[PDB]
RNA sequence: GGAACCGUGAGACAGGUGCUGCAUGGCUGUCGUCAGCUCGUGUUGUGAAAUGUUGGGUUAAGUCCCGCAACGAGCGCAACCCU
């Protein structure tokens, strides 16, 4: 289970750009940054944790959000550990409300790969090839991650409340949970189960990606295993 | 007996560039062949609507990025035909 005492890592964050709504998260501004109190994350991080462990062990999807390119790849390999969804690249209008549409798009681009592969690859013009192409690399942008959807999550888990506002504002309409790891710079009332530490620094965000993941595959159907997101940590 | 065309007598009936295109269809001219014109969804407004195509640098041009409540899509241009 994850370890206490993170004063060398998490902490404080920002200079003067804070919310007064993450006051009682905050120990005191000194000379730069407001410091955000471990005493009061640590109770946190149970709450979370404990809420994790019941969707975790009732086989319940998770959708991690990470658009910054400060846990870009942390959130990724974060999310391939275990069975969960993610968004690295850009978080489009109606994918869950308008499904079916957004989904032949999916299938067009196995139509095309199917095509791009060896069958039919160079029959017609060049200008053609060339305009089956980039509609390919368009859809494999922004169809990475979605690709793998094929019905309809119970909670998302973000990296930050307002580079992600987007995906936070839809998931408390749809009455969804929903998890992150923001600092001052935030609204802490849109996050029910919000987690006070640093949302930037590679290494502040792979520490919780990394144990909340190793949370999910025990007690569910798996062992734990070492975190290799600290290989991307040395971007220091 | 009787079909047909035709002529006379008799009966039932025809026609109109005569008016109105501010009653109209169709066709055509004109700004124009100039050119943009619109849609789906999200957001803003009580609403008619607005945003989306705002801002910074640049380009012949929304030409294209950066930032970015917006993200995408269908006609126009272009291309397809002919000298």
């Given at each position: 289970?994850?370890?206490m005492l993170k004063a060398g890592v998490h902490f404080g964050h920002q200079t003067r750009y804070w919310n007064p709504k993450m006051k009682?998260?905050?120990?005191?501004?000194?000379?730069?940054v407001h410091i955000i109190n471990l005493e009061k994350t640590v109770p946190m991080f149970?709450?979370?944790?404990?809420?994790?462990?019941?969707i975790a062990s009732r086989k319940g999807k998770i959708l991690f959000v990470g658009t910054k390119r400060a846990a870009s790849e942390a959130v990724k390999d974060a999310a391939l550990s275990c069975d969960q969804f993610f968004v690295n690249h850009r978080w489009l209008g109606g994918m869950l409300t308008n499904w079916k549409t957004v989904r032949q798009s999916i299938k067009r681009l196995k139509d095309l790969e199917t095509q791009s592969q060896d069958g039919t690859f160079d029959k017609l013009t060049k200008?053609?090839?060339?305009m089956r192409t980039r509609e390919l690399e368009k859809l494999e942008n922004s169809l990475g991650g979605i690709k793998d959807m094929g019905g309809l999550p119970d909670?998302?888990?973000?990296?930050?409340?307002?580079?992600?506002?987007?995906?936070?504002?839809e998931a408390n309409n749809l009455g969804?949970?929903?998890?992150?790891?923001?600092?001052?710079?935030?609204?802490?009332?849109?996050?029910?189960?919000?987690?006070?530490?640093?949302?930037?620094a590679i290494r502040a965000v792979t520490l919780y990606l990394g144990?909340?993941?190793?949370?999910?595959?025990?007690?569910?159907?798996?062992?734990?295993?070492?975190?290799?997101?600290?290989?991307?940590?040395?971007?220091?």
């Open positions: 289970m994850r370890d009682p998260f905050i120990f005191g501004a000194r000379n730069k149970n709450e979370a944790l404990a809420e994790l462990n019941k200008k053609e090839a060339l909670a998302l888990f973000v990296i930050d409340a307002d580079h992600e506002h987007i995906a936070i504002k969804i949970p929903v998890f992150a790891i923001v600092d001052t710079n935030s609204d802490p009332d849109g996050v029910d189960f919000v987690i006070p530490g640093n949302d930037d144990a909340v993941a190793a949370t999910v595959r025990e007690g569910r159907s798996q062992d734990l295993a070492s975190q290799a997101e600290e290989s991307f940590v040395e971007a220091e």
